[PDB]
Amino acid sequence: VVGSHVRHHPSPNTYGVEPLPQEVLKKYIIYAKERVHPKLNQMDQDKVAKMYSDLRKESMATGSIPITVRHIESMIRMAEAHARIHLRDYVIEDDVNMAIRVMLESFIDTQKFSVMRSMRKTFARYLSFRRDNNELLLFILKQLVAEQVTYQRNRFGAQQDTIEVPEKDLVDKARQINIHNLSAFYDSELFRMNKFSHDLKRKMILQ
Amino acid sequence: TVRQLESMIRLSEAMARMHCCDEVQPKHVKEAFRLLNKSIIRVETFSEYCRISNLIVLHLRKVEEEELKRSELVNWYLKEIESEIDSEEELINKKRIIEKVIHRLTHYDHVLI
Amino acid sequence: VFGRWDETKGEDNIDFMPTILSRFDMIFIVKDEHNEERDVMLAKHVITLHVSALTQTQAVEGEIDLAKLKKFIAYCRVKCGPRLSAEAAEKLKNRYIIMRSGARQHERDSDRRSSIPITVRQLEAIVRIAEALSKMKLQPFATEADVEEALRLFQVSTLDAALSEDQEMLSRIEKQLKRRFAIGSQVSEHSIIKDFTKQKYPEHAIHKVLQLMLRRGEIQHRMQRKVLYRLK
Numbered sequence A: 001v002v003g004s005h006v007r008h009h010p011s012p013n014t015y016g017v018e019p020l021p022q023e024v025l026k027k028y029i030i031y032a033k034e035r036v037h038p039k040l041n042q043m044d045q046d047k048v049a050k051m052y053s054d055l056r057k058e059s060m061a062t063g064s065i066p067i068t069v070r071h072i073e074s075m076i077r078m079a080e081a082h083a084r085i086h087l088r089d090y091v092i093e094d095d096v097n098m099a100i101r102v103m104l105e106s107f108i109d110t111q112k113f114s115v116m117r118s119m120r121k122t123f124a125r126y127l128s129f130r131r132d133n134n135e136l137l138l139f140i141l142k143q144l145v146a147e148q149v150t151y152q153r154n155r156f157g158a159q160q161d162t163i164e165v166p167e168k169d170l171v172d173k174a175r176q177i178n179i180h181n182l183s184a185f186y187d188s189e190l191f192r193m194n195k196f197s198h199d200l201k202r203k204m205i206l207q
Numbered sequence B: 001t002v003r004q005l006e007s008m009i010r011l012s013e014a015m016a017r018m019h020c021c022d023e024v025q026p027k028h029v030k031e032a033f034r035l036l037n038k039s040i041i042r043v044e045t046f047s048e049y050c051r052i053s054n055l056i057v058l059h060l061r062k063v064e065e066e067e068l069k070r071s072e073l074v075n076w077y078l079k080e081i082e083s084e085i086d087s088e089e090e091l092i093n094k095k096r097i098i099e100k101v102i103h104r105l106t107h108y109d110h111v112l113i
Numbered sequence C: 001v002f003g004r005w006d007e008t009k010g011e012d013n014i015d016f017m018p019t020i021l022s023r024f025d026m027i028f029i030v031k032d033e034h035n036e037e038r039d040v041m042l043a044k045h046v047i048t049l050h051v052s053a054l055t056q057t058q059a060v061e062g063e064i065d066l067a068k069l070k071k072f073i074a075y076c077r078v079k080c081g082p083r084l085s086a087e088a089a090e091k092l093k094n095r096y097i098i099m100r101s102g103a104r105q106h107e108r109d110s111d112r113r114s115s116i117p118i119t120v121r122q123l124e125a126i127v128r129i130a131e132a133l134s135k136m137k138l139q140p141f142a143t144e145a146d147v148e149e150a151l152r153l154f155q156v157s158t159l160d161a162a163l164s165e166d167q168e169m170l171s172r173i174e175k176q177l178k179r180r181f182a183i184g185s186q187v188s189e190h191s192i193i194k195d196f197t198k199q200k201y202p203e204h205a206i207h208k209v210l211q212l213m214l215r216r217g218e219i220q221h222r223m224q225r226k227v228l229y230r231l232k
Helices: A002-007 A022-035 A045-062 A069-085 A093-109 A114-124 A133-156 A166-174 A181-186 A189-193 B002-019 B027-038 B047-066 B070-081 B090-107 C019-024 C036-052 C066-079 C087-112 C121-135 C146-165 C164-182 C190-197 C204-214
Strands: A164-166 A196-199 A204-206 C186-188 C219-223 C227-230
Touching: A022 A069, A045 A069, A045 A114, A045 C036, A045 C204, A069 A093, A069 C036, A093 A114, A133 A164, A133 A181, A133 A189, A133 B047, A133 C121, A133 C146, A164 A166, A164 C019, A166 A204, A181 A189, B002 B027, B047 B070, B070 B090, C066 C121, C087 C121, C087 C146, C121 C146, C164 C190, C164 C204, C190 C204, C204 C219
Parallel strands: none
Antiparallel strands: A164 A204, A196 A204, C186 C227, C219 C227
């Protein structure tokens, strides 16, 4: 915000390589709308049916806001949208998986705390399509840091100058998510972006 | 919110205009920050009860998620406080206070079952 | 009223007064019958429809075109209108008397005013449905088969809506569970299942009651999904 204010006086942060210019984006949108019509001749009905049945069963097991047919249709629409992005005349498994992930995220985000947590724990398989393990580890580390900061603020009455967390808890949670290596996460750019440091002398993570 | 940040920038610019300086220096920012802090007024109703309740909730939720009874909770809290209480009178007073607070939380506030 | 139907509550799920409900000839109730095998059929049917919408638009088995059906309906409505016969009238009289007596007996036994009453308007509705069925065949007089079909439809819709043994048995299970449970006590699901199977009640009813209680929020899970505890 301050940079934007300073730049506009009267007198590259994302992982993407290069954003497209606005005119090229407009031309791409026009061309995709005009000349792309994806077809669903290669859909896999069995997987969708099994996923819908499992979703309905577990939603009723939780007992709040069951899923319906409508979402599936929306999923199909999203799939076609993805097929329009790549100019594919036929929809493939990648678009279907992306639409499934988006629909499941949207459905889960609307539930209350306990139900949302249970659904997120249960459906980790579908929500992890084309995701980054570094992002998940960062989320775990953020949760641990937030818990530690909350405890410190509640007990001491004020924040401390440094935040530390043992590596063993993160390793155990990664094992729970079936991750056994964290060297790449330490060497990842996300680790440095959030100003985290790893100390092997004490086997700790400091922020 | 960020609107407060924009207001701080505007107040710094206003102070710079008032002092006729051609650039914004940290004095103006400090003055704007002080004025914005003095604008905000805290609500008067109690903090100790909230802190104790938050600590109890955090401990119970951590226990539930990682893998006790009321007596176990009280014993754990006293064990954690051990380094903070020097006399038996203060210890028993705090024990009675936490017992009453736990009873209120379980029965009155319905926070704990 | 609550957003989703509650089978055990029976009545009070309809906010409309009985006066406006008496005007309607038939009332249908649809519920989300959750079957594992049924959902796969629906999903496959939807996907097949979406796929085949692009290529072919043809009648499945002798289905009439929309324009042809419209013109045929208009022609039938304009052309002729039938009326009832004596034997069908006597049969409908007997059936209506029996239905009204049964409804009165049910209201007296249940000790609660039914939100869907039965009156002369229902008899006129049955007459009208029989007349429509006769009109569908352009016959000048209705037959007993049309009256039987109209009575079957009126039963399946209205009597099912109003009388809404399965539900009474579910209510019995609900009352028994409420009496057995206590506030703050924990119960294992296996114990409930064993206790109600020793009473020879179906397991599906118990599971449905448990799901409804979970929806209401009375029952919560303490340790994974094995042991439940009662809340309010």
